[PDB]
Amino acid sequence: AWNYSFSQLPRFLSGSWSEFSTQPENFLKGCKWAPDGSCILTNSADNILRIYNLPPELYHEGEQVEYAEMVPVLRMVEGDTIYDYCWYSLMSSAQPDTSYVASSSRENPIHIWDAFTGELRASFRAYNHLDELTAAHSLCFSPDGSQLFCGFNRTVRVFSTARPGRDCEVRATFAKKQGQSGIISCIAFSPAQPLYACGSYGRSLGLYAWDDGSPLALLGGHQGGITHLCFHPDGNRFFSGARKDAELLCWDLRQSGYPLWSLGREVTTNQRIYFDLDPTGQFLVSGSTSGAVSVWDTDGPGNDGKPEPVLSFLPQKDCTNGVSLHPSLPLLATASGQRVFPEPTESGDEGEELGLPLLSTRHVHLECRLQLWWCGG
Amino acid sequence: MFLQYYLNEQGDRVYTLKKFDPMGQQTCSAHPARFSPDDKYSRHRITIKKRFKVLMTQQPRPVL
Amino acid sequence: MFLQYYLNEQGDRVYTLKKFDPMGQQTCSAHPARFSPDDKYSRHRITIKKRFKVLMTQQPRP
Amino acid sequence: QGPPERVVLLGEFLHPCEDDIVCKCTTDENKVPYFNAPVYLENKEQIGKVDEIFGQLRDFYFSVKLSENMKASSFKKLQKFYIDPYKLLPLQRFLPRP
Amino acid sequence: GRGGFGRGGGRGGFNKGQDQGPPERVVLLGEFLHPCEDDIVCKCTTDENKVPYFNAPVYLENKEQIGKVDEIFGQLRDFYFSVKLSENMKASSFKKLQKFYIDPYKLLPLQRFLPRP
Amino acid sequence: LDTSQWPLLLKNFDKLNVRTTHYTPLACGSNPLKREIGDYIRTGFINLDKPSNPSSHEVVAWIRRILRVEKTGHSGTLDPKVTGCLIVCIERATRLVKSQQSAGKEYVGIVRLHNAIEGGTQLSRALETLTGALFQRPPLIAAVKRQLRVRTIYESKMIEYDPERRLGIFWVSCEAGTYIRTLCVHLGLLLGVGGQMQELRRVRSGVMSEKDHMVTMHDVLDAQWLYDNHKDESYLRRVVYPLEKLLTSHKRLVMKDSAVNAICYGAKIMLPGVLRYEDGIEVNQEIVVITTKGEAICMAIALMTTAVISTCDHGIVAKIKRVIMERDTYPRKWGLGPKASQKKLMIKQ
Amino acid sequence: EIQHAEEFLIKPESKVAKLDTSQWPLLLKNFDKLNVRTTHYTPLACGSNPLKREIGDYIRTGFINLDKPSNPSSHEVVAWIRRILRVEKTGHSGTLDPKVTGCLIVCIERATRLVKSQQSAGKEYVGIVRLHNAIEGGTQLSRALETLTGALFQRPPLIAAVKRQLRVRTIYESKMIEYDPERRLGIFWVSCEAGTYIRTLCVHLGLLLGVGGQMQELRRVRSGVMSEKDHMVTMHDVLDAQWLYDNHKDESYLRRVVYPLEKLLTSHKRLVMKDSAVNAICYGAKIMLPGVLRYEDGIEVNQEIVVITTKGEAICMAIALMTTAVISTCDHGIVAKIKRVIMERDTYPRKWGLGPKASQKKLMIKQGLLDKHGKPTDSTPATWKQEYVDYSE
Amino acid sequence: SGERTYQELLVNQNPIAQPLASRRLTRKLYKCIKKAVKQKQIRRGVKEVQKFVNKGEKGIMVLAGDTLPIEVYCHLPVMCEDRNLPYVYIPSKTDLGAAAGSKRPTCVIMVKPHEEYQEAYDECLEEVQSLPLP
Amino acid sequence: RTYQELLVNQNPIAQPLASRRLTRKLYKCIKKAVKQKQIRRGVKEVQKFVNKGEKGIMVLAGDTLPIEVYCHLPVMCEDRNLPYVYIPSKTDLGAAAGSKRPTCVIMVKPHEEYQEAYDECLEEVQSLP
RNA sequence: GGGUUGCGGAGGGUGGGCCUGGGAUCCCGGGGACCUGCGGCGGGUCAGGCCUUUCAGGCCGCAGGAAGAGGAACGGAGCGAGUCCCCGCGCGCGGCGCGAUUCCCUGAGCUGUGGGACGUGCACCCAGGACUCGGCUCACACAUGC
């Protein structure tokens, strides 16, 4: 029994920095946990699917935890750039068959690898009208574990898990009078009622049905395009995060058509910022672009409600992209990453004069590491 | 389009996949620019070409 | 078989009994190789002859 | 609606290809398979149908689509594949026009 | 049809002794040149038109059967033939300038051998 | 000047076997090169570079609207997203486009794969395997009509291959009708990884290639502007080329000037009309007859052989197939022969 | 200098017309050196040159020069060629022994007409003679080899069937190249006519030397008109040609190995004829004066000639009867007789009925003056009866 | 290192690349562009450049020296000459695009002064108005 | 001088040759392996065992006429993904094989612990241009 | 295809015409068409069975003909409709591009050598082969001579 509460600063226990250095520039993003919580998926700039293993819980029981480097047990290759990746819904060590992971590349079809063996088991391909292959953006599994949802230009296609072929259910969203938006960012499911929300890139949000597939509500977005969306498990609550916006909004199913409350974030560039939510609904951790991981508190007494910040801490001076927490054991993993635009400064004059600035942009240090934070009681 | 090419010694087209030639030349695109029917900027093209003598008329005569 | 021959300057066949030419050439056999009726290796021969340009097709007709 | 009947050997397993079975044609000595033709096994069981066909005139391959509740890892060996004889077509009229 | 000096019988004429025993007439056949693997090859000196017959017994001056003509070769002008020796004989015994005789009716004229259109 | 440095239908005119050299040179006539602009634009072909943005259906319309003509036709129906050579004819040049369409054309495209390949040797073997006659089907879904097509491929080799990006360019030389998308699909299915075609670029289209006056439509527009605003026809002649150059590999048959009008109105080529001929003309061959100046009258089908016309005195040697010249081009002189006209008048009297 | 738009016109020079017929194909070579007789005829369209012929007729009509392996027999390689080429008939030029290599002429369907003359042709042979005892010098062997020259007798070996009778074969040239005393072997070259045996020759050489011997091996250099220097092909190329034709549709490799049958009758005198008479001669007839178009100078009486068409196809082989100096003066008569047909019976338009004299004779039969079977009828014109009984009747 | 790089850039140029600048001239131009991009006063694209030249906008035109084919930018110099506008050519494409603030090559760039950073802009204008024209 | 004479008497179709020391190392390896377990020397048996499948190294001769004798072996090795070599010597190879008549094709299969020198030749053949 | 005889002791080899019928060198009477291509006619072992096959020579049976071989215009070209094989909008037309007038992007989704959104319009949908029928102009045609 480990009580989950925030009372002190996160504690460093282990890290991994030997990799992601062979390439000139590399950026880390994602770093989500498994439903059972025994594997960690890490995506880098160079397309390599690294599955990091979970440190032993018996090693986390004591405070004598020493620093260690988690070697990847699996190293998969991918040709083109990756768009999205997620673990299976019913992921458990007991069932050896329901232990696969999904991935969608740029031009390659949706590939599915196995955690046990490490090889490609199945792959779902989707063609457009004439003869060409279209790219998928959204990737998330169904709670029942028999259907698969993927995003596209202006429609959503539903794939199965028993017939790996071309058969798929198409559900168009854009119409002559209606239409949500262009490229769909992601799709998240709700465990309370059979409905899922579709987050796009054009200041638009909408919820559909599970089997019927009919729109219920339609909302907007902060200023740009929604990036990530989760669902609060306690009830009819869910958050959403956009790109290049310094404000956050929480939409509720009990309200009709307007944001109930607004929060503040820090997003400078068009990055894929993640924000994890605790299953008990007491803490809301979210990473910023200016290098400051902030956490909020969700109070549910019954009459008063306001997300209040508990504390804040900066892991590094980079941009923390992925922040996720372990389901049961107190644990928090973070990853950093930020692009460097070419700045051709006049180095000849700098080497000639040796005067005022005495600065060069060639020695700038950028390293993306994977830390593990500890939560006390 | 990642389809570049460089002129050969004999005078034929050698299509390549890289953007840099091993001899030290910068490869160019193999496809021409898009054409626009409603284009009223054809008077200046012949002027530019005559100023630098890069017209088909300023080049040698075809052998046939 | 002890029948050897070497190409002449004009282009005629000169049969001999030795295995070495006085000019410094190694003589070859004069009898053809064994041909099998159940020979299904006619595509590999044509491919390896096209890769090295040694077929009779590229040779002209005198 | 057709019950099982006399079946004729069609192809040999070469290797799978994206949940599809790419096979090499066996000795039917002049025959080419029909499109969407049901393929059977040694136990007279409907495994699937015939997908797109390619290859040269003499040696040509073909891919097979799987049916419902089927696995591609089952017949990962060198076995024979059989097809109905009514799904054939003489090619002696293809090359000669007269 | 067939017939004549036999083919289901036996008769006799000028020469008799080929199958009967003691011969009656003899004709010079060849001259000793040199031995050839226990065989004697001879050259016909004077028969003036004739060549020997297949497996024709050869005799000496004393009318003694030494052997039989085995093979025949040579040109039209210069003709040669070999002799197969019999048992209990020696090829080195006949190593002088002597003549070899044969039966007179064991020859064949070459006029029929000449091609005539 | 030598006899081997002359223009298109004038090289090595002395090598043509001589039969008779007593003819009357007529006043009317012209050379293909020094032709009037009105006839230089209405007659001839154009080898322009098609942009990869539009399709050929719009390219031919744009070129016939710029050239201000009535009839035009292309050599091959190219896709919208493909570059390559394209021969476009005019109203007096689209007569022989049916034979130009059915010609061998080379293609260069890039193939994108899905899974990983071990080395370039296995894929090279797979590319060498798909050589010769194979089976193909349209990439889209069609009716019972387009069920199976049979094409042939002569040469196929790959230049490079990128394992990090999973691409690779190749060069295929085949005849008209063969598809490249289905070829890349079959290649990916044979490698066991699948794939499609990224792009495509045509290097050769029949007899013309990208090394023989690769003009651009921008140049055609500049020429049309210069011919109207500056009255300069040199830049218009540099882009347009006569149609007599396409029939360069065909055998030539020099004819008399009196028979030019007979062939134009439609007749049969006889022995006294033929002046010279080319060695190596077999029965039923696609022959083109030209004038003494070098203007192609029309295309014919020769019946007799060189060894037969070298001995024969009268008869039919060629048959009219398709006229290219105009009707009113030479004077009307048919019944004025030494003996034939005499016999005709004798039977008339 | 790049001259553009220059006045170019063929100058009408009234000079003599000359033709160069030295580079034309096999039967069209030197087609202008034949004395011209009449150039007034109507050429027919049904016909082509043997060089530029259809592949269906190229494989049907033509010969091939093969290098037979030493493992199988001649009949076996003939049957293998017949099975590879997918034909019905196949013939050879000489029955070679299993352990005898060399060239071999093979026809298929329509070139098998003249195989009886090709079988009886002079051929060259090269083999190795094995000895038993030792020879003193090579001069004695050379003397023994030159002694066996001309016409001599030869006995059939025990191998083939049995000693039947005695034959008389002629040998033209025989000379030895080398001789090794350490291995007791030696190569020799003999050029003789068909029917001569090499094993019997080696046996006779060994009997003359006084050491004996047999024939170790044998290799044919020349067989008739074709030798090992004239596009000698093997069976592997013949087998690869069918595969390249049924898989790649390339007939060049098949036209390179197979050669037209008109090449054999190259050293014979050609006789150009009209297209109206080719079918009548294929059915069967005599060669007349009006059908003759050109002839070769230097023709004697009873000489082996070949009848060719204007395009260059060998019609048949005939026996010339008249001389060039006689055929230039004579107006009507027989000049050649049909001996062996080479073409088919239905290849040209069947027309032999109409004519300047045939139609007149038929109309006279139809009237009632002359009779078909009865020659001595009224026959009012005597110059007609004295000018129609000069061929055969 | 600078001379070799300049020679390599001179090797890979365009036929119409006669009006050029020196080393310090190019450095000053790059510094001015980098100081002007942060104020959002730059335009990148032939479409909008010609769209606003048709109406009229004074400024300095900066074209690339290595950009094929030639028909891409063939009417811009004559348009600037008719509108009495100077134009600049530099033998670089990656550096010109990186100075704009991206990792992509850019060829066409127009500058427009809004703030008081024109003290260095007028010097560059007077210098481009004095370079030898072909 | 010797290698030049061997290159003069070469077969037309032989690209993958060896150097002056790689051939010595291969000869040493073959002489060591001929006594350890086995070496297959015969066209018929080599092709019969390749039909079913056997990994190894093909050692062909550089001077063997005609070419139709060994003309489908290297293409078969490429189809089976197996490397091969070419050496301009037949007498030395025949003497090293079994001290007998000159052989043409030789196949090697590792059974003992002598593969430490065999993988080096394998990677050298795989690196051969 | 059939038949007879002589020569060398013995199942094996070689060879034989335009002449005959009647009467006293002569007379009388007779022999009633040819060419071409294909298949067979031989050897070996014990009155018969089995195998392979053409060097030397004619015979038999079948398929075509009564073959002296003619021709200085029987003979062409520009169009329209129907159906089939052919054409990437598969017979549902608007998911197509270029432009004045507006906006956004260094997006991490192609993407400024262009793409994303709104309003207003002009251009874009065409060709081969075979067959039946209707329908006009030309000419009906061997090609000189100064």
Residue numbers in the entry:
A (entry chain B): 145 to 521
B (entry chain J): 1 to 64
C (entry chain F): 1 to 62
D (entry chain H): 64 to 161
E (entry chain D): 45 to 161
F (entry chain G): 47 to 395
G (entry chain C): 29 to 421
H (entry chain I): 19 to 152
Sentences from the paper on this structure:
On the other side of the holoenzyme, two sets of H/ACA proteins (dyskerin, GAR1, NOP10 and NHP2) respectively bind the two H/ACA hairpins of hTR in a tandem fashion, forming the biogenesis module. The 3′ H/ACA unit has an extra protein component TCAB1 that binds the CAB box at the terminal loop of the RNA hairpin. Interestingly, the 5′ tail of hTR, previously predicted to potentially form a G-quadruplex, folds into a short stem and is stabilized by an arginine-rich motif of GAR1 in the 5′ H/ACA unit. The other is between the PseudoUridine synthase and Archaeosine transglycosylase (PUA) domains of two dyskerin proteins near the H box of the RNA; the convex helix α10 in the PUA domain from dyskerin that associates with the 3′ hairpin complementarily fits into the concave surface on the opposite side of the PUA domain from the other dyskerin through hydrophobic contacts. Consequently, the two H/ACA units are arranged in a tandem manner with a ~55° rotational symmetry. The ACA box (A446–C447–A448) at the 3′ terminus of hTR snugly nests in a deep cleft in the PUA domain of the 3′ dyskerin similar to the contacts observed in archaeal H/ACA RNP structures. Strikingly, nucleotides A372–G373–A374, corresponding to the 5′ nucleotides in the H box consensus sequence ANANNA, are recognized by the 5′ dyskerin exactly in the same manner as the ACA box by the 3′ dyskerin. The CAB box fits into a narrow cleft on one side of the propeller, with nucleotide A413 pointing into a deep hydrophilic pocket formed by Gln415, Gln482 and Arg483 of TCAB1. Hence, instead of being a guide RNA, nucleotides C431–C436 in hTR 3′ hairpin function as a pseudo-substrate and block the pseudouridylation pocket of dyskerin. Collectively, the atomic structure of the biogenesis module provides a structural explanation why human telomerase is not a pseudouridine synthase.
